[PDB]
């Protein structure tokens, strides 16, 4: 088999995809599992003046494995508008719809040279890419496994379970992981009691990302 | 037929259920459609010291139609903890699980005396009530129509469409309405372009609450 592919989505923008992706790739690389970070679609950027977008952060990490990589090797559709990608594309690049067949080829080409290809999405599972496809559709076309990152605040129960319902209704292997930030102990008192109950009753438990680097590495790499 | 019943849920706590419920009930009552507001389950309250919970606000509105109403007539399970109702119940009232058969009877009794019974939920569609039921399950047992209120910020696309997927996967009549707050014009530039596209492609469009009091009154009251 060629390298494994793990898509990283989230309950919400700013839940922690980039933070968690970078931590997981660092952990895998430290275990000798050669791992690249890709951000194929990114909104909210201005590359002429700012070098700290997600693709820039990924690029810094990635060049520890390949100095020759450049931004355009790991991120392909980039927009200024802080919006769903479909809208940003229609406004800023009307003649170039996002081509997910092209993306699928470019992402799978990295499975030749990496043990694990981590793909950060944008927006959320239902956020529109093209007129006919959302982020989940893209992940399904990739045949990737899915890591959905949740925020750690009140509301995470509802958000996790809305995504669980959508994911379980589709043919893909997925995990949900809560990105539990430092200084948050309300989580343990308010939300954790239900996560624990849910996990006794579910075949696919919701985990805490920070407790789960080994589990998530195992998940990403298992099988064919 | 006896009075109609409309359940009000949301994308997130604080999206605007109470605000929108009170506006819709006021509009219906001003049209001669006798409407009561109920908050059967409420967390985060301390009735010994605070009289501005959702049930208190509903009670003030409701007593314009019936002076004899009291808090216990319109709200039945009330907890101090700011959490999902299941957790608050297990911690504060371990011997009294929330009984949704009891709730269904109490809520339906108001269809004798009102043209429309508006029922605010808590937490979100997937938030747990009992070990076996969430808010959506409660609304399904009620046989109510559903009004899901969305927030108006970046992220509303994903949130609305996650709820749309869950709702359309169940046997109930529902609308999604965005609670568009004053002073928000980013909405029109950032999110509205996709809502408009989605609505051309959907048999059940996402509306803006503030544009939709007549439409939503019609929805709540139509048919048997
Ligand atoms: N565990 C954490 N501890 C402390 N800060 C965090 C943590 N996770 C995320 N952050 C901060 O929260 C912000 C958002 O996190 P980030 O990982 O960029 O989210 P994201 O989901 O990738 N955002 P986006 O790609 O724009 O949708 C950043 O400033 C992070 O540094
Ligand atoms: N359209 C609006 N314009 C201005 N303020 C609003 C608007 N909608 C909601 N708010 C305020 O936002 C806060 C939350 O609204 P509220 O209607 O109480 O939400 P909710 O969904 O019922 N909350 P909860 O029942 O606790 O889950 C309140 O302080 C409201 O006054
Ligand atoms: Mg990111
Ligand atoms: Mg409320």
From Swiss-Prot, chains A, B:
GO terms for molecular function: ATP binding; dethiobiotin synthase activity; magnesium ion binding. It catalyses: (7R,8S)-7,8-diammoniononanoate + CO2 + ATP = (4R,5S)-dethiobiotin + ADP + phosphate + 3 H(+). Substrate binds at residues 43, 155-158. ATP binds at residues 13-19, 54, 120-123, 179-181. GO terms for biological process: biotin biosynthetic process. Phosphate binds at residues 39, 120-123. Its EC number is 6.3.3.3. It is an enzyme of class 6 (ligase). CDD domains: DTBS. The active site is at 39. Pathway: Cofactor biosynthesis; biotin biosynthesis; biotin from 7,8-diaminononanoate: step 1/2. Catalyzes a mechanistically unusual reaction, the ATP-dependent insertion of CO2 between the N7 and N8 nitrogen atoms of 7,8-diaminopelargonic acid (DAPA, also called 7,8-diammoniononanoate) to form a ureido ring. Homodimer. NCBIfam families: bioD. This is ATP-dependent dethiobiotin synthetase BioD. The gene is bioD.
